[PDB]
Enzyme design. Sequence first.
Site, PDB file in Angstrom:
ATOM      1  N   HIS B  40       8.857  -4.588   6.439  1.00 25.93           N
ATOM      2  CA  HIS B  40       8.010  -4.477   5.259  1.00 25.93           C
ATOM      3  C   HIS B  40       7.309  -3.128   5.149  1.00 25.93           C
ATOM      4  CE1 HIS B  40       4.821  -5.905   8.111  1.00 25.93           C
ATOM      5  NE2 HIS B  40       4.089  -5.064   7.402  1.00 25.93           N
ATOM      6  N   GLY B 142      -3.495  -2.310   9.723  1.00 25.30           N
ATOM      7  CA  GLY B 142      -2.868  -1.199  10.404  1.00 25.30           C
ATOM      8  C   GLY B 142      -2.272  -1.521  11.758  1.00 25.30           C
ATOM      9  N   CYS B 144       0.191  -3.773  12.327  1.00 32.45           N
ATOM     10  CA  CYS B 144       1.588  -4.180  12.260  1.00 32.45           C
ATOM     11  C   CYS B 144       2.468  -3.249  13.071  1.00 32.45           C
ATOM     12  CB  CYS B 144       2.067  -4.205  10.815  1.00 32.45           C
ATOM     13  SG  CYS B 144       1.599  -5.738  10.105  1.00 32.45           S
TER      14      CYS B 144
HETATM   15  C1  LIG Z   1      -2.025 -13.122  -0.138  1.00 32.63           C
HETATM   16  O1  LIG Z   1      -1.197 -13.143   0.990  1.00 32.63           O
HETATM   17  C2  LIG Z   1      -1.816 -13.637   2.145  1.00 32.63           C
HETATM   18  C3  LIG Z   1      -2.633 -14.758   2.074  1.00 32.63           C
HETATM   19  C4  LIG Z   1      -3.246 -15.246   3.225  1.00 32.63           C
HETATM   20  C5  LIG Z   1      -3.041 -14.613   4.442  1.00 32.63           C
HETATM   21  C6  LIG Z   1      -2.215 -13.479   4.514  1.00 32.63           C
HETATM   22  N1  LIG Z   1      -1.857 -12.696   5.541  1.00 32.63           N
HETATM   23  C7  LIG Z   1      -1.049 -11.734   5.132  1.00 32.63           C
HETATM   24  C8  LIG Z   1      -0.437 -10.642   6.007  1.00 32.63           C
HETATM   25  O2  LIG Z   1      -0.767 -10.548   7.141  1.00 32.63           O
HETATM   26  N2  LIG Z   1       0.543  -9.726   5.441  1.00 32.63           N
HETATM   27  C9  LIG Z   1       1.133  -8.671   6.246  1.00 32.63           C
HETATM   28  C10 LIG Z   1       2.165  -7.906   5.417  1.00 32.63           C
HETATM   29  C11 LIG Z   1       3.567  -8.521   5.392  1.00 32.63           C
HETATM   30  C12 LIG Z   1       3.743  -9.672   6.381  1.00 32.63           C
HETATM   31  C13 LIG Z   1       3.969  -8.942   3.980  1.00 32.63           C
HETATM   32  C14 LIG Z   1       0.002  -7.725   6.643  1.00 32.63           C
HETATM   33  O3  LIG Z   1      -0.804  -7.409   5.836  1.00 32.63           O
HETATM   34  N3  LIG Z   1      -0.117  -7.210   7.995  1.00 32.63           N
HETATM   35  C15 LIG Z   1      -1.229  -6.329   8.312  1.00 32.63           C
HETATM   36  C16 LIG Z   1      -1.806  -6.794   9.647  1.00 32.63           C
HETATM   37  C17 LIG Z   1      -2.698  -8.007   9.392  1.00 32.63           C
HETATM   38  C18 LIG Z   1      -3.967  -7.522   8.486  1.00 32.63           C
HETATM   39  C19 LIG Z   1      -5.081  -8.024   9.072  1.00 32.63           C
HETATM   40  N4  LIG Z   1      -4.647  -8.596  10.472  1.00 32.63           N
HETATM   41  C20 LIG Z   1      -3.223  -8.533  10.562  1.00 32.63           C
HETATM   42  O4  LIG Z   1      -2.587  -8.894  11.494  1.00 32.63           O
HETATM   43  C21 LIG Z   1      -0.770  -4.873   8.391  1.00 32.63           C
HETATM   44  O5  LIG Z   1      -1.254  -4.139   9.185  1.00 32.63           O
HETATM   45  C22 LIG Z   1       0.354  -4.387   7.474  1.00 32.63           C
HETATM   46  O6  LIG Z   1      -0.136  -4.221   6.190  1.00 32.63           O
HETATM   47  P1  LIG Z   1      -0.713  -2.721   5.877  1.00 32.63           P
HETATM   48  O7  LIG Z   1       0.245  -1.702   6.450  1.00 32.63           O
HETATM   49  O8  LIG Z   1      -2.060  -2.582   6.543  1.00 32.63           O
HETATM   50  O9  LIG Z   1      -0.836  -2.547   4.384  1.00 32.63           O
HETATM   51  C23 LIG Z   1      -0.859 -11.873   3.764  1.00 32.63           C
HETATM   52  C24 LIG Z   1      -1.609 -12.998   3.374  1.00 32.63           C
END
Ligand SMILES: COc1cccc2[nH]c(C(=O)N[C@@H](CC(C)C)C(=O)N[C@@H](C[C@@H]3CCNC3=O)C(=O)COP(=O)(O)O)cc12
Lengths: 299, 299
Positions: B40, B142, B144
Site C-alpha cells: 500500500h 509511519g 508500517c
Molecule cells: C477508516 O479506516 C480505518 C478504520 C478503523 C481502523 C483503521 N486502521 C487503519 C490502518 O491501519 N490503515 C493502514 C493503511 C493500509 C492498511 C490501508 C495504516 O494507516 N497504517 C499506518 C500504521 C497504523 C497508524 C497508526 N498505527 C498503525 O499501526 C501507517 O503507518 C501507514 O499509513 P501512512 O503511511 O502513515 O499514511 C485504517 C482504519
Amino acid sequence: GFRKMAFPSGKVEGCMVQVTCGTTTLNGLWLDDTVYCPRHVICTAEDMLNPNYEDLLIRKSNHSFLVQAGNVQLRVIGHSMQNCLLRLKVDTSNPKTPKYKFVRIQPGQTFSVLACYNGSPSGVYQCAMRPNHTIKGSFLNGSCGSVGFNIDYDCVSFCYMHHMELPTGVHAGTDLEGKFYGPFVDRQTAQAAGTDTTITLNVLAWLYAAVINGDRWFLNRFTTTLNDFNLVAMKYNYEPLTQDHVDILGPLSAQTGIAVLDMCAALKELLQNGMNGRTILGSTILEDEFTPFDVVRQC
Amino acid sequence: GFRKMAFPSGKVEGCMVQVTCGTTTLNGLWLDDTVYCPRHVICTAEDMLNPNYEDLLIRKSNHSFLVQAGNVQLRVIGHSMQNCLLRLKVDTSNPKTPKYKFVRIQPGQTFSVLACYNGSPSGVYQCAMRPNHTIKGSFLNGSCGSVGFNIDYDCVSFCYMHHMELPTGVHAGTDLEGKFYGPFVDRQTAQAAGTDTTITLNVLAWLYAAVINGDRWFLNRFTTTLNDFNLVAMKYNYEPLTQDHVDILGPLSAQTGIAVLDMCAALKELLQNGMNGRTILGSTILEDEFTPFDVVRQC
Ligand SMILES: COc1cccc2[nH]c(C(=O)N[C@@H](CC(C)C)C(=O)N[C@@H](C[C@@H]3CCNC3=O)C(=O)COP(=O)(O)O)cc12
Ligand SMILES: COc1cccc2[nH]c(C(=O)N[C@@H](CC(C)C)C(=O)N[C@@H](C[C@@H]3CCNC3=O)C(=O)COP(=O)(O)O)cc12
C-alpha cells in the site's frame, strides 16, 4: 497499547567486548582506543572481602588482560583506574564507535540495558533508576560490565555499568566515570539499599495514561495544594512532587483537561483508601517506571 | 528479576530503509539486493478505501519508487508484488545483510519488534502473536513496514511485517511472504478480529518462572486431570491444554519439581478465586506472552 520499549541496541552492540583477567571474565565497553570495565575483574574471590585495588592494580601488567572483540584479540597498550572503572588503552580504535556522551542518570529517569554475557549481547530491556539508587534489573552471573544507555538523535548517552547484585534482588553499578550510584562499594559486603520510595512523577504519568485510555473511575473533585499533597505522599513512601515535576506534567494535563493538582488529589485518595480491588490499566498496582515522556510518545 | 526482554536489534537495524511512492512513505526491509515493504505504499487515500493493487502497480515504473538507506539513495532496478508486499530489486546488495530466514510463526509464539519511523529505528519490544492473529503492539503513524523477528545463534528469523491498526487498537500484518496473519486485508476499512483467548501454555510457563525465581505462594497440594482442568479453562476463555503442550513443559517441570498437572491445579485455583490482591512476578495479572522457551533462556 502502553508498553515499555527499549532503544534500538545496535550502536551499543558494536562496542561490547570481553575482558578476562586470570579466572574472571566480564564485559567491557570499547569506544575509540579505550576499553572500560568494572575494576573488580582484577580481583580474586579472596580479594573480594576487602580489596586494596591500588595494590592489586600495580601488580598487573598490560599482558595480564585478555581483551576479545568477538573473534579478534586486542592488545592492551596501557591501563589506569578511574574510580571503580578500569580504563584499558588498546592497540586498535573501534571502527564502530558511535557519537557518544557519558551522563549521570537521575532517580526516576529510565534507560535501556543491553544485557551481555562473555561480551555477547543477549537481550535489551528498559528500566529506571530508583530513588534509592538501585535498579530492578535482570542480571545473571556473567553480566557485570553490561551497559545502560539512552539514544537521542544519533548520539548514545551511556549512563550505567553493572557491578553488583544486592541481597534484595536489585542491582547496583556506576556511571561511565566509575562513580557508584548510591552508597554501594565494589566488594563483597553486608551492604543493603535504603528504603525505596515510589516515583510519584511516574505514577502521575501512568494515571494520565489511564485517563487517555478511557479509565477514570479514580478521578474526584477534591482540591489539594502541592504542599498538602507532598505531606501525604511522604507518609506513604512516595517521593514528594517538585515544581519542575508539575511543569513536566503540563502537556498531559492539557491533553486530558485534568489539572496536575487535581490528578494529585486523585492519587492522594488512592493512597489513603486503596484501590478496593478495582484495577487501573488492568492492574491493582500503581506502575512507577513509565515516564511522562513515555506516555506522550505513545499517546 | 524477570522482565520481558527483546533480542538485540543490531542485525535488523542494518536492514531498515525508507520507501516513498508519491506522497506516502514507509519502512522497508533491505536484504541482499531486494527491498520488501507493504504494497500500500503505492496507494493514495482514495485508493485505500477499496484498491485494485494489480491495477495500481501496472501503472508504476521503477522510477516511481524512491528508496533511501540513510543518506544514500538506492536505484530501483525491478519490481513485483508478492501477496501484500512489494519486492523492489535494487542495484546494491546490502553489505549488512545477516544470515536470515523467513518464517511464519504460530499463535502463542513471541518475537521482538523493531518499531521504525521513516526508515529510522525508534524502539524495540517483545510481543506475542495472539490466538486471534493480531498483536498488541506499539505502532504509531509511519510505522508500517516495521518488522518482527527472532534471533538464534547468528541467524535472524523474520516473522512479521506491520501493516495496520484495528479499531480496537491491536495490530495486523503479514509474514515476509506477504500473507496476512488472520482474516484481514490491506484496505482502509474497519475489520474485526475473532474473539481472543488467553495462551494457557504461556501462563503455565510463567508460573514456572515464578517458582524458579522466587515465590511459590500460589502452589497447593492438589492435582487435576487434563480433562478436568480444560473444563475450567473453557469457562475462563483460556486455550485448552493438550498433551503436546504438557510434553513442552517437561523441562520446566523437572527443574522445579512440580508436575505439570499440579501446576494446572494451582492455575485453576488462581482462576477460580482470583489472586486476592497478591502479586506473582511483580504482576497482578496472569502474564501470557512468555513462552516456555523464553522462560528457559532467561531462567
Ligand atoms: C477508516 O479506516 C480505518 C478504520 C478503523 C481502523 C483503521 N486502521 C487503519 C490502518 O491501519 N490503515 C493502514 C493503511 C493500509 C492498511 C490501508 C495504516 O494507516 N497504517 C499506518 C500504521 C497504523 C497508524 C497508526 N498505527 C498503525 O499501526 C501507517 O503507518 C501507514 O499509513 P501512512 O503511511 O502513515 O499514511 C485504517 C482504519
Ligand atoms: C557477599 O557477596 C555478596 C553477597 C550477597 C549478594 C551479592 N551480590 C553480589 C553482586 O551483585 N555482584 C558481583 C560481585 C560483587 C562481589 C562485587 C558478582 O558476584 N557477579 C556478577 C553480578 C551479579 C551476579 C548475579 N547478578 C549480578 O548482578 C558479575 O557480573 C561479576 O561477577 P562474576 O565475575 O560473574 O563472578 C555480591 C554479593
